[PDB]
A paper describes a structure:
The PHDs are Fe(II)/2‐oxoglutarate (2OG) oxygenases that catalyse hydroxylation of prolyl‐residues in the oxygen degradation domains (ODDs) of HIFα. The oxygen‐dependent prolyl hydroxylation of HIFα isoforms signals for their degradation via the ubiquitin‐proteasome system. Inhibition of the hypoxia inducible factor (HIF) prolyl hydroxylases (human PHD 1–3), with consequent increases in HIF levels, is being pursued for treatment of anaemia (via increasing erythropoietin) and has potential for treatment of other ischemia‐related diseases. We report structure–activity relationship and crystallographic studies on a promising class of 4‐hydroxypyrimidine‐containing PHD inhibitors.
To explore diversification of binding in the hydrophobic pocket at the PHD active site entrance, we selected the 4‐hydroxy‐2‐(1H‐pyrazol‐1‐yl)pyrimidine scaffold because we predicted its C‐5 amide group would bind to the PHDs analogously to the C‐3 group of the spiro[4.5]decanone series. An X‐ray crystal structure of a truncated domain of PHD2 (tPHD2) with MnII (substituting for FeII) and complexed with 8 was obtained. The overall fold is similar to previously reported PHD‐inhibitor complex structures (backbone root mean square deviation with a structure of tPHD with 18: 0.7564) (S2‐3).7 The structure reveals a binding mode for 8 involving chelation of the active site metal via nitrogen atoms of the pyrazolo and a pyrimidyl rings which adopt a coplanar conformation. The pyrazole ring of 8 occupies the entrance of the active site pocket that is occupied by the CH2CO2H group of 2OG during catalysis. Instead of interacting with an inhibitor carboxylate, the guanidino group of Arg‐383 is positioned to interact with a formate ion, likely derived from the crystallization buffer. The terminal phenyl ring of 8 forms an edge‐face π‐stacking interaction with Phe‐391 and interacts with the Arg‐396 side chain. Recently, we reported SAR studies on spiro[4.5]decanone containing PHD inhibitors, leading to the identification of a hydrophobic pocket close to the Fe(II) binding site of the target enzymes. The side chains of Trp‐258, Trp‐389 and Phe‐391 in PHD2 are positioned to make hydrophobic and π‐stacking interactions with the biphenyl substituent of spiro[4.5]decanone derivatives. Targeting the hydrophobic pocket at the entrance to the active site of the PHDs enabled identification of 4‐hydroxy‐2‐(1H‐pyrazol‐1‐yl) pyrimidines selective for the PHDs over structurally related 2OG oxygenases. Modulation of inhibitors elements binding in this region will likely be useful for further optimizing 4‐hydroxy‐2‐(1H‐pyrazol‐1‐yl)pyrimidines potency, and for improving the cellular activity of the compounds reported here.
Residue numbers in the entry: 189 to 243, 251 to 405
């Protein structure tokens, strides 16, 4: 359960490696339901965020609050993510997590598109923990690719994360974990939520106002 999973794995694993994976997070029924909602978003051309603003990502994204009609199971996923982070309260490094972003739903077309190497939060914008959920049924990375490769600072080796179905991924959002998405040869879906550190976000606000 959430508390046991948080205190006995996520907290120790995050403090040791900064990268954490939870498999079969929600179960098959809920996983396929989340997939159905995401596919509905894709089929009705909802991945149009940024499409009206001038400058280059190759994927398509949309932001989900979780309470929109047809997005309820995504909201349920977001609730479960929150339960875990809440049960970690105060024990995740030195962070005091007080908020989060909406869910970013990302679609990778499958024509070799991936995501260039980057750092999620390199300039202290307040994001401390990156949470990704994968909903790709029967993903065989040997053929379909789409592996997320993370290069943790203070490790010799890199960490390869297959976007397997019903998999949850946690990692520090700062310079410790640069990462890239390898080319995708099948439609690849991911849902990402970012949690905020209170004081770092306050410092960021002060910088914006100063
Ligand atoms: O950083 C990102 N996008 C910009 C962003 C994200 C969240 C934000 O929320 C807030 C809101 C308010 C204050 C601070 C942050 C803001 C900007 C971002 C990071 N990785 C990826 N990957 C794609 C594949 C693997 N990784 N794609 C991304 O688009
Ligand atoms: Mn990223």
């Amino acid at each position: 359960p959430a508390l046991k999973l948080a205190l006995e794995y996520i907290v120790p694993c995050m403090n040791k490696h900064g990268i954490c994976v939870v498999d079969d997070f929600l179960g098959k029924e809920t996983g396929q339901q989340i997939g159905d909602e995401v596919r509905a978003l894709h089929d009705t051309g909802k991945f149009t965020d940024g499409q009206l603003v001038s400058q280059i990502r190759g994927d398509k994204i949309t932001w989900i609050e979780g309470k929109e009609p047809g997005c309820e199971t995504i909201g349920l996923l977001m609730s479960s993510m929150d339960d875990l982070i809440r049960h970690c309260n105060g024990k995740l490094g030195s962070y005091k997590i007080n908020g989060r972003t909406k869910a970013m739903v990302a679609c990778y077309p499958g024509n070799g598109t991936g995501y260039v190497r980057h750092v999620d939060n390199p300039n202290g914008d307040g994001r401390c923990v990156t949470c990704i959920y994968y909903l790709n049924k029967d993903w065989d990375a040997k053929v379909s690719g789409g592996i997320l490769r993370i290069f943790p600072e203070g490790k010799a080796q890199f960490a390869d994360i297959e976007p397997k179905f019903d998999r949850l991924l946690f990692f520090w959002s700062d310079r410790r974990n640069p990462h890239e998405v390898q080319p995708a040869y099948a439609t690849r879906y991911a849902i990402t939520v970012w949690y905020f550190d209170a004081d770092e976000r306050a410092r960021a606000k002060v910088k914006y106002l100063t």
